[PDB]
Design a binder for this molecule. Structure first.
Ligand SMILES: CC(=O)N[C@@H]1[C@@H](O)[C@H](O[C@@H]2O[C@H](CO)[C@H](O)[C@H](O)[C@H]2O[C@@H]2O[C@@H](C)[C@@H](O)[C@@H](O)[C@@H]2O)[C@@H](CO)O[C@@H]1O
Length: 219
């Protein structure tokens, strides 16, 4: 199998994990279906880097040093079912970055510096797994999970949820109403609807009473 240096390839799998890559390898085989780039030292993605990988189904970019995604970086990846961006340095994502990714089933974004739910995620109707843990989220916009009707795993822990602000009630009610899909991480997925906790009080978000919140406490 054609294969870049410091990767191992078999079939349509290109495995470049844990090989000290400082950049995405050149010449990634265009027939690739699974691409492991996780646990490297990749500090950026060049615009258009994945444009040729039209058959790609799974892309793992976790545990790198990414601070941004190029506009349209995943647009060619219409067959993509798994995307892992966890453990990077992402702050804000391009608004349209998920617009062509309706086939996506698993989207992992823990352990970044996200302060809002990225735009577009609410339209990814096929998601079964969505990981937002250990970011800087304070709330979830009203209705944002309403069409994610296939979800089985939602990771929301490790965020400083602002339980004083009335905007938290959407998430409060959502967690309360979907207890079976709220997951914590004990080195594995463990169902725990108390795992999303209020900033400061470290009380469960789902237990928050409407009356304890206020629409005047929403910076
Ligand atoms: C290629 C691959 O499978 N990578 C996985 C990676 O996604 C895992 O990260 C965990 O993902 C889940 C969602 O499925 C939760 O978001 C976990 O919090 C997350 O783990 C976090 O990152 C890892 C690297 C550790 O630091 C962990 O302690 C954090 O909570 C990891 C889990 O080990 O396996 C992979 O590398």
């Amino acid at each position: 199998a054609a294969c870049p240096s410091q990767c191992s390839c078999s079939g349509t799998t290109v495995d470049c994990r844990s090989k000290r890559h400082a950049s995405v390898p050149a010449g990634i085989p265009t027939n690739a279906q699974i691409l492991y780039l996780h646990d490297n030292q990749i500090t950026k993605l060049e615009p258009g880097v994945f444009d040729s990988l039209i058959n790609l189904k799974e892309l793992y970019l976790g545990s790198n040093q990414l601070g941004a995604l190029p506009v349209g970086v995943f647009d060619s990846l219409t067959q993509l079912t798994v995307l892992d961006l966890g453990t990077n340095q992402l702050t804000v994502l391009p608004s349209a970055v998920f617009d062509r990714l309706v086939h996506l089933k698993e989207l992992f974004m823990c352990c970044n510096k996200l302060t809002e739910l990225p735009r577009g995620i609410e339209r990814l109707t096929h998601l079964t797994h969505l990981a937002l843990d250990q970011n800087q989220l304070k709330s979830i916009p009203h209705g944002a999970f309403d069409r994610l009707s296939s979800l089985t795993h939602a990771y929301l822990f490790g965020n400083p949820w602002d339980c004083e602000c009335r905007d938290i009630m959407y998430l409060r009610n959502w967690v309360a109403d979907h207890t079976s899909i709220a997951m914590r991480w004990d080195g594995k997925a463990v169902n725990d609807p108390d795992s999303a906790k209020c900033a400061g009080t470290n009380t469960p978000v789902r237990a928050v009473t409407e009356a304890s919140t206020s629409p005047s406490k929403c910076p």
